[PDB]
Paper text:
S. aureus YwlG is a 174-a.a.-long uncharacterized protein member of the UPF0340 family with a DUF436 domain of unknown function. Here, we describe a dual-function, hibernation factor hibernation-promoting factor (HPF) in pathogenic Staphylococcus aureus that dimerizes 70S ribosomes and represses YwlG-mediated glutamate dehydrogenase activity via a physical HPF–YwlG interaction. Conversely, YwlG binding to HPF reduces the formation of 100S ribosomes. Our data reveal the moonlighting role of YwlG in regulating the abundance of 100S ribosomes (via HPF) and the important role of YwlG in glutamate metabolism (via GDH activity).
We determined the X-ray crystallography structure of YwlG to 1.75-Å resolution and did not detect bound PLP or other ligands. The fold of YwlG is characterized by a central eight-stranded antiparallel β-sheet decorated with three large and three short α-helices with an unusual 12-residue-long carboxyl-terminal extension. The oligomeric state was determined by size-exclusion chromatography (SEC), in which YwlG was eluted with a size corresponding to a complex equivalent to a hexamer. Consistent with the SEC analysis, the asymmetric unit of the crystal was six protomers that made up two stacked trimers. The carboxyl-terminal extension appeared to interlock the oligomer. Analysis of the multimeric state of the protein showed that the hexamer was a stable composition, with a solvent-accessible surface area of 39,710 Å2 and a surface area upon hexamer formation of 12,540 Å2 (estimated G: −56.6 kcal/mol). We replaced the invariant residue C69 with a serine because C69 was oxidized in the crystals with unknown significance. The hexameric structure of S. aureus YwlG remotely resembles the structures of members of the catabolic, NAD-specific GDH family. First, YwlG is half of the typical size of a GDH and lacks the N-terminal catalytic domain and ligand binding sites. The inability to detect PLP or other cofactor binding in the YwlG protein crystal could be due to instability of YwlG in its PLP-bound form or the missing component(s), e.g., HPF, in the heterologous E. coli from which recombinant YwlG proteins were isolated.
Author numbering:
A (entry chain E): -1 to 34, 38 to 174
B (entry chain D): -3 to 34, 37 to 174
C (entry chain B): -4 to 35, 38 to 174
D (entry chain C): -4 to 174
E (entry chain A): -6 to 174
F (entry chain F): -4 to 34, 42 to 174
Write the structure that this text describes.
Amino acid sequence: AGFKDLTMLLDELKDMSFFNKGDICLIGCSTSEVIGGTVGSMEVAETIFNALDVVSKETGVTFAFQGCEHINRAITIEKSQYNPLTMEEVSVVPDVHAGGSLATYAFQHMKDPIVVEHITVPCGIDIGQTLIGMHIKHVCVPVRTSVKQVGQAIVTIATSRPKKIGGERAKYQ
Amino acid sequence: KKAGFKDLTMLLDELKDMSFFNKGDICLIGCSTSEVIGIGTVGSMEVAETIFNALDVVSKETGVTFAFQGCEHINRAITIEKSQYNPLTMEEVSVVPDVHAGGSLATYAFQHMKDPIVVEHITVPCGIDIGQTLIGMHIKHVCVPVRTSVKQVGQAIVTIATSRPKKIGGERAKYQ
Amino acid sequence: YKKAGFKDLTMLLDELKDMSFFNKGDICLIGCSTSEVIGEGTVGSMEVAETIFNALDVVSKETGVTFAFQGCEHINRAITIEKSQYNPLTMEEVSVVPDVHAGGSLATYAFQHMKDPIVVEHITVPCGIDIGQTLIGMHIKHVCVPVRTSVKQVGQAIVTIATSRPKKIGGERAKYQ
Amino acid sequence: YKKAGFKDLTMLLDELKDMSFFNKGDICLIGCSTSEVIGEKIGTVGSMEVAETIFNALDVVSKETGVTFAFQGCEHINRAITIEKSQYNPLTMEEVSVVPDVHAGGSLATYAFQHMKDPIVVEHITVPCGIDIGQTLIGMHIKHVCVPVRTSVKQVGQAIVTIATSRPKKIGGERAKYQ
Amino acid sequence: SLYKKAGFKDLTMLLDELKDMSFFNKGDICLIGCSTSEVIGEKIGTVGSMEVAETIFNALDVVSKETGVTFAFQGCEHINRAITIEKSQYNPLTMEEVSVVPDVHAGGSLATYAFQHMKDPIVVEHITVPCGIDIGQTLIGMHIKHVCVPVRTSVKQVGQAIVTIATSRPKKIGGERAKYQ
Amino acid sequence: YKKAGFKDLTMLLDELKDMSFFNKGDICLIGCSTSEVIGSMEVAETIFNALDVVSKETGVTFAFQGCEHINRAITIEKSQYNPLTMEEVSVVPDVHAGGSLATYAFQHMKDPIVVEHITVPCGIDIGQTLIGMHIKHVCVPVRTSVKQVGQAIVTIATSRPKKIGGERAKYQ
């Protein structure tokens, strides 16, 4: 099911250099979409969190976890990734029914978690159509993958690239 | 039996019934006509036409207006009627959407608007994404997905977003 | 004589009127702690809120100024205003219903007695009145200028009055008249 | 000093009119150094005479085209801009407290302030076009993207003149179309 | 010696109280708003007002060395409440240097004293800091990081000047189901 | 000295050096129209190379404004890119879409990037391309005895803080 699909998706992304040292990658997830209760949903969250952590150690990318709309899509990150110049800490503690399973799991298992109101990151992974485009550095570009689902959840992968500028005579090489 | 038409008509009727379209709002459309089919410019422009025309019916019924996201080659710049341009919140840019640099629907919309202009960025209260082009960068915070019984338009996955204010306040705060 | 703070507030408002503090079309931000007025309970606090809200409404009708009500820190000092004063260009609506223990007595009273209330995250206004040292400076248009009044308290609450004026710019040779 | 620059300025303004540079309802920013027009340091009487001639020529254009003018002050007043209050937009501009003087603001800004119906000074401004007489620099005030305008009249008296208009950013990759 | 002593005991007690409630954190900036005339309770000349400024500055400096907090000094409205800080605390990313030199009659006594006794002073147009102390109702809330929270103290005055203390904390967010622990 | 602009530019740069215009760690923005100098890649080369000498002597670095066809986007070394204050854009300056100097600079930098906007403390405009949009407020023109580079009018800008305060304010 979801574990096999996720493992394959992550290996594919690694192989296409989607995960870059020092980048933050935003995760949008709905564990219920993966399956199609809080015990079960937290087990899925655990598996996803742990798989992402392996990728983090292999590639040097770090992950940020989007909460659900009840907490205004506020984002859980490690304090070591907090930049006060670009981010604003907010007070809330993600819960299964107010944040969602993965953000809740991430908060509980981080060394020093904090929640920020907004974030801009160069890439992200959306599992189950929660939407993540508000978080991706302009210009947001979808990434085609061979693995299109994690369990029963549609997956969307986004990267980013600079705006192209200039008129008819402009060159790009 | 024209590609997408029946699914789109059903989706729009559903949205109407849930008061998704409000008089005076702008609704952003993200579309990939190739996703609807699953391939040339003739065919893609025919799909664009059907989508544009269905949206126009909704516009006349509800008083909502539509904005059309271009593809990444033109930096997702947005085509709108000049009557909806607000210089205080939007920045006009120079480009003319083309099938191979903008995409079929943005190109069709540009050509069939009374007085089109293209803006670099936009913030709108709701939107419809046909074919996973992504539209969340355009939706007023906080963006809320809308569940519909119609999941596809032709072969294209469809995503619907509305918006609502940030909920603020600590443990003792009230919301009614 | 029936209401705590009423005489002091009436005198303060008359003074402010006389110094042209209240201008047609301006928004004036009110910061209030009703417990400070009494000197430290929901019945009593709501009575004070009522008196303040009602007195301010009279001023509004006389001068054409409108009032915005700051909430407590539990609602992030969010501001309650009439929807007719909402400007989407400069303000951001947020979802919260002020309550006595989550917003404060005056914001709660104002919310319940407005025609069409909304709450915004932040606001910038040309003047304001702080009853009981809640602080209002974050809301006042730069440059914020304190206004001296002969009325220093409303009941037991210290009162602070702020207006605003443009930044003064220019080097040593600059002129100002 | 009452005649200095007059012929050149009049010709430059007529040229600009003829190329539709002045549009009804637009604001055009003026940067001026009256000493550059003469070509030497001149005293306040002379400098104010040059300011008067420039102001009056601009006013004729204003009445003919419906454009309005904004006047940049010198660096001593932080390049603050003098405009008619009727053109103040609090959403985009910030009023500042200063009264332009010949030795703190410059002759033209001072003259403009004194002869406007209801002048105010703002800290910054963004406008679609402008005219710089004597290389005071005005590009900080012009809407992006700022585009120099070629003119047949290149000087007003001894002052180099720079004319700027504006146009949208051109965007898109190599496949993008502009017509 | 009147003006050299005025406010000293009250200020020292206020600062000890604040220390005890962990108000002063290493590496934070604390904004000071002051009116020396309020401390005395009447208009006073420049000699006297500068003596009060000295006493305040010196008391704050003791706290600075003990806690590792640094102080920023708000000027009066004549200089648009511009703020005097040590250059070591200047962050060009978040602050904008302006040109003015605080004077007793254009800046106020404390900002003037601070400017003259700093190692390398700079004046900035605006600042956002996590906490502050207002002596004499000059208002300081425009400088405090959102969300600004008043701090209750048992010391209510420094001499004759009403004292207000502010700290800051993050916005609380989320709906009715949200958790904060 | 016969190479177009070279003598005038060398004198201008020496003058500026002598008035401490070039400071270690500053970025200086160059606006150039090589056609104005003459009346184009050879001129660009001479300018770029002269500026590079100054860079090594003073520790200032240079940023090169492109023409209006590329929205005055600015070419800089990546080592000077600050993502907090600048935004990378995709374009490669060309002689007919960027101008000769920006084109030359792009091709001869170690690791060039183009940014949409920039704010720098000082700049040099050769041929009235305009550069004031890039200069830190408050922008102050600098008078030089060298008025032209070849046939191109030259403008020099530095910057200083806003002066603030009312009539009683002091500035020393």
